[PDB]
Amino acid sequence: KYFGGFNFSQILPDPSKPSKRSFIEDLLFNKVTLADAGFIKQYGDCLGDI
């Protein structure tokens, strides 16, 4: 990790993250209030009363 002294750790993917993402990518996902609206199976959530 010596690219001439350039600090590339904030954009290279973190092996500790299970999604293989970086700090800035995680911040970009956290900064958008994304609604899935049916990306996964959720008819069981619909039939359950709330």
Ligand X SMILES: *[C@@H]1O[C@H](CO)[C@@H](O)[C@H](O)[C@H]1NC(C)=O
3-state SS assignment for residue 29: helix
Residue nearest to ligand X as judged by C-beta position: 44
- Options 1, 15, 30, 35; binder of ligand X; rule CB under 6 A: 1
Cβ neighbourhood burial of 46 (10 Å; 0-12, 13-18, 19+): exposed
Residue 1 vs 31, nearer CB to ligand X: 1
Q: Which stretch binds ligand X (CB under 6 A): 14-22, 25-33, 36-44?
A: 36-44
Q: Which stretch binds ligand X (CB under 6 A): 12-20, 28-36, 39-47?
A: 39-47
Q: What is the DSSP letter of 23?
A: H
**Within 10 Å of residue 5's Cβ, how many Cβ atoms?**
5
